[PDB]
């Protein structure tokens, strides 16, 4: 049982949830300006945790034909869990999830569900299906964020945090996809850069120039001050001055430079909402 | 210089850095009851920092020819970072670490140094010397509580955890070494197991029951309640039963086993004392 715990949680890919759960209590410390409930925080951090880990179960379900080759020492695999074992499982933490999201509140519900629906779709044909699948990824890594700020009393800046983590993830989902092109091409991968091109990079843009736009919002409405609306204007510089490197250098070489760089501003202004949220 | 920075963080190894800080942040909040200042904080969190960062420099520093063998791929023996740009370095963060804890108090700038002394020592020469270097990393990863402990209202409770941390981590040292018994042996490597047989197995459950036997007077001392007691009676008899199954049977696969599972018991100890402080 010390060896099937691990087994177990090697499944959920527990640090993983952890680190989702972690996001959903951040966004609950922005919504609430670090006035914290700990039964809200508790039911935050469960709902993430639990849903996260559907995620990850669902996620080597389907993956189970394709972990025997790639990956053999996986739980799946491996026979150390059987198919019908982890299929009960992922029902088990579904339920435990969207349960404990009715003791929040029916946003926290809406967003639980469509989590649970985008994580199944996302494992069983979007993963490989790249136009939708970057879209999945940038949502799925926002939510999170949002989860936690609609338990708190000011959700309004982690909407806007929800909206640039989507739209600056998809895109940058875009640019690994034009470094990756031929290693997908010759996998059955379909992707904006193998059916468009260059032209995919305008779209990349477009997304990182919209939530650029959004940016600056918690400061014009009053929420945030001074900090947030230094710190985010050197990484909307930042962010428009990456893109047009990519855009002026189309390549492999320069995608991936950009893509680790957005990571970089992206964990900047994650910080900024922190800060900003510092107002205590 | 973004892969020179990048260099610089595995020299201090930036990740252990950040973990030994938090470690400073839990002894704050035990200390103060969450009733947390903003540039008390930022004091211990930076003041930890910069000590182990120091740490890990100067071990590195003294390991440059063994590290050839070892871990060829650190900065000093891949030839990355020249010796006299990691001694100067070296300085710089303790200089630092030093002058920060001066604006703590007193208690602070005792730990700081005591903790730089040992840290240089261990690298210099008590990390082959087992008797004395199970003790340095016992006091260690106590020190850390101890330090943002000290920057609290109510030191007492995290001088309970800096106690029983550095006897059970000194205790478990014993238990890894003489695990270890074989390799460290053909390796010119001295310890207690290697000195003395079993007998130092007597002498790590001494310090255990050290441990078990301080660890109520936080409840006893009505600083803590009932959740603290619950949790320190289960973890104080799994700490003896470990010990007992170890000395009846004294072996390699004993030692390995009692290892991990000290391990398990000390992060469940560590959680009672938060959840003790929790109850605000
Ligand atoms: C009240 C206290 C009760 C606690 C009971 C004790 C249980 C703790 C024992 C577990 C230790 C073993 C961890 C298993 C590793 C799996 C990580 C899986 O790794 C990952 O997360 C992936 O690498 C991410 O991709
Ligand atoms: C901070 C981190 C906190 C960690 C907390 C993790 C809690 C783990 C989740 C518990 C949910 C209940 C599921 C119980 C397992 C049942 C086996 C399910 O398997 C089956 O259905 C098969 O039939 C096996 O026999
Ligand atoms: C054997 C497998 C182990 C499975 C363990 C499952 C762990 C479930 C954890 C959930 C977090 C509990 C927080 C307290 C809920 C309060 C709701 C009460 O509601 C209220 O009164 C108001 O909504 C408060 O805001
Ligand atoms: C095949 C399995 C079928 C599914 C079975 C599910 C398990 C049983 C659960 C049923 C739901 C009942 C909980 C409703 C209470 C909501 C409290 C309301 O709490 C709140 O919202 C607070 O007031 C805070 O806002
Ligand atoms: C009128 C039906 C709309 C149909 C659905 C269209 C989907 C498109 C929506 C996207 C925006 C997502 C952010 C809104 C969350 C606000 C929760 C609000 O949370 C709260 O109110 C907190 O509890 C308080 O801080
Ligand atoms: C001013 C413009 C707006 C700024 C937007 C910044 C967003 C704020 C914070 C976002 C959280 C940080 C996530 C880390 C990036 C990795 C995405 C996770 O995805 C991945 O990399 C993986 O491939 C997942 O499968
Ligand atoms: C409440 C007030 C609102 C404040 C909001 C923040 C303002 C920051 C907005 C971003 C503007 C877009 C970035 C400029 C283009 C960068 C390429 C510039 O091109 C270059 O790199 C040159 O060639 C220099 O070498
Ligand atoms: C406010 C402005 C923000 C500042 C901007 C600076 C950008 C930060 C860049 C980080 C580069 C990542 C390299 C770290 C590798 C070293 C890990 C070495 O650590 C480890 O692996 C462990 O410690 C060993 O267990
Ligand atoms: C005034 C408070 C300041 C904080 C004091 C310094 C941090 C001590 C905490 C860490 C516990 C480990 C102790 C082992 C000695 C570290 C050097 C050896 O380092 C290493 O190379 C590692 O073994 C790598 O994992
Ligand atoms: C081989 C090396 C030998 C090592 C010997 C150790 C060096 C001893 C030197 C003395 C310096 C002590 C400074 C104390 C001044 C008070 C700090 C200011 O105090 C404060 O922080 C607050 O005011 C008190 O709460
Ligand atoms: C190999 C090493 C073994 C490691 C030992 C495992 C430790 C045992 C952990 C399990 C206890 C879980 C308690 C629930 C708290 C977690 C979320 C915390 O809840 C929250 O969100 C906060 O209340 C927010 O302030
Ligand atoms: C095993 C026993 C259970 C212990 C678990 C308790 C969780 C820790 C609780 C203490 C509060 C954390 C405050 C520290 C914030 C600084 C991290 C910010 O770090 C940074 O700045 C980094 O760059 C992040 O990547
Ligand atoms: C209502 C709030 C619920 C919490 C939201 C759950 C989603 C998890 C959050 C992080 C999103 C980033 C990763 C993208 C999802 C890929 C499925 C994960 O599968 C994978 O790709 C691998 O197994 C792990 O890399
Ligand atoms: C108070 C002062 C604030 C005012 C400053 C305004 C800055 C707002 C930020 C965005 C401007 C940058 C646009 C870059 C995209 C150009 C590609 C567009 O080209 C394309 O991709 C097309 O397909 C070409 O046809
Ligand atoms: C409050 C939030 C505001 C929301 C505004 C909605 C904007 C409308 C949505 C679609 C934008 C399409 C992306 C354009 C970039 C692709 C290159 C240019 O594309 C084209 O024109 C050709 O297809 C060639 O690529
Ligand atoms: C087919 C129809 C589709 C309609 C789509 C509409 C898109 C809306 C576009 C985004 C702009 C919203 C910004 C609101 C902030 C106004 C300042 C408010 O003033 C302030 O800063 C106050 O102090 C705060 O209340
Ligand atoms: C009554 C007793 C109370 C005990 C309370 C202790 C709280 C402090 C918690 C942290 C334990 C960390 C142990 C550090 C020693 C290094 C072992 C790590 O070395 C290892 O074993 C390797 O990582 C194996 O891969
Ligand atoms: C792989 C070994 C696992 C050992 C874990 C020991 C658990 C300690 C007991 C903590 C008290 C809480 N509870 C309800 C789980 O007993
Ligand atoms: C093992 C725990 C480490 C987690 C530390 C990172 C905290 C930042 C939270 C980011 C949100 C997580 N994400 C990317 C899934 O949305
Ligand atoms: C009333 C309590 C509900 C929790 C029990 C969940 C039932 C799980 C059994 C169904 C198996 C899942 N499936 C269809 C994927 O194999
Ligand atoms: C038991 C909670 C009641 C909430 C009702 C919503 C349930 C909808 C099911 C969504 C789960 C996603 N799915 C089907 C892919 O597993
Ligand atoms: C594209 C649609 C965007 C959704 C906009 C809705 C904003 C959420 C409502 C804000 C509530 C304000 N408050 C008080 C919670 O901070
Ligand atoms: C990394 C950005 C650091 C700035 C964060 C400061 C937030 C605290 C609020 C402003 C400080 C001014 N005050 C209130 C002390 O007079
Ligand atoms: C890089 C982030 C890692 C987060 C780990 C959190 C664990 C905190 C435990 C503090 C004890 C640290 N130690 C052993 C050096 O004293
Ligand atoms: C409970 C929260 C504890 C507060 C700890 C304060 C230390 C924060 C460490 C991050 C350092 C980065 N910086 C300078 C931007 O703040
Ligand atoms: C005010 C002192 C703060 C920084 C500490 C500097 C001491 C490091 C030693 C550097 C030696 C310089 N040099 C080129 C002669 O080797
Ligand atoms: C800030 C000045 C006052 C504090 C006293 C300074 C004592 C420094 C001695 C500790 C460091 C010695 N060393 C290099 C062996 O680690
Ligand atoms: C047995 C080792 C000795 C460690 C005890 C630490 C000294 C007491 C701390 C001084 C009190 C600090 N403060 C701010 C709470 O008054
Ligand atoms: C082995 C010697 C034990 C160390 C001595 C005890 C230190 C006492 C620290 C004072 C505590 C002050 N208080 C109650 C406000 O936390
Ligand atoms: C270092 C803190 C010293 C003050 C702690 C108070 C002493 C405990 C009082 C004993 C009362 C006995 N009892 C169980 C009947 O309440
Ligand atoms: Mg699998
Ligand atoms: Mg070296």
Do not use: H, Q
């Not at 680190?19 to 993430?48: P, Q, R």
């Not at 990756?180 to 779209?203: A, N, T």
């Not at 930042?238 to 990519?246: G, K, S, V």
Request: charged residues 20%.
């Amino acid at each position: 049982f010390m060896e099937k715990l691990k087994t177990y949680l090697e499944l959920i890919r527990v640090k993983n949830c952890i680190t989702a759960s972690i996001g959903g209590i951040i966004g609950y410390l922005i919504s609430s300006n670090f006035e914290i409930d700990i039964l809200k925080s508790l039911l935050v951090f469960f709902v993430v945790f639990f849903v996260c880990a559907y995620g990850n179960v669902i996620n080597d379900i389907f993956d189970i034909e394709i972990d025997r080759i790639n990956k053999p020492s996986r739980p799946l695999p491996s026979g150390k869990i059987k198919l019908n074992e982890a299929k009960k499982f992922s029902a088990i933490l579904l339920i435990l999830g969207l349960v404990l999201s009715l003791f929040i509140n029916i946003y926290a519900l809406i967003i639980a569900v469509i989590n649970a629906l985008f994580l199944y779709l996302y494992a069983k044909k979007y993963k490989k299906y790249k136009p939708i699948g970057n879209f999945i990824i940038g949502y799925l890594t926002g939510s999170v964020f949002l989860f936690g700020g609609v338990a708190g009393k000011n959700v309004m800046p982690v909407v806007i945090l929800f909206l640039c983590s989507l739209l600056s993830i998809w895109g940058r989902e875009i640019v690994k996809d034009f470094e990756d092109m031929e290693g997908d091409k010759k996998e059955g991968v379909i992707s904006l850069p193998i059916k468009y091109g260059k032209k995919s990079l305008y779209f990349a843009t477009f997304l990182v120039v919209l939530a650029v736009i959004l940016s600056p919002l918690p400061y014009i409405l009053k929420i945030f001050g001074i900090w947030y609306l230094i710190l985010i204007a050197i990484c909307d510089i930042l962010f428009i001055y990456a893109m047009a490197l990519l855009l002026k250098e189309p390549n492999k070489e320069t995608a991936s430079k950009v893509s680790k760089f957005l990571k970089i501003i992206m964990n900047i202004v994650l910080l900024a909402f922190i800060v900003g949220a510092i107002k205590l």
